[PDB]
């Protein structure tokens, strides 16, 4: 579909979860599970979930 940045920074609350910085921008895995998307960090190249309302669509 589209990529996505962040608008805020967030900490991992999990052992499989990422932790990020404001302006970062990822790429969807998977997006139909909800609020709760599945995700590739494309700056440290690690897999995890993060919360969708921290992101906004580019462009």
Not at 6 to 15: C, G, H, M, P
Not at 34 to 52: A, F, K, M, N
């Amino acid at each position: 579909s589209t990529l996505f940045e962040a608008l805020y920074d967030y900490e991992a609350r999990t052992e499989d979860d990422l932790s990020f910085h404001k302006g970062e921008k990822f790429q969807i895995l998977n997006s139909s599970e909800g609020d709760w998307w599945e995700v590739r960090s494309l700056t440290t190249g690690e897999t995890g979930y993060i919360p969708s309302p921290y992101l906004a669509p580019v462009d």
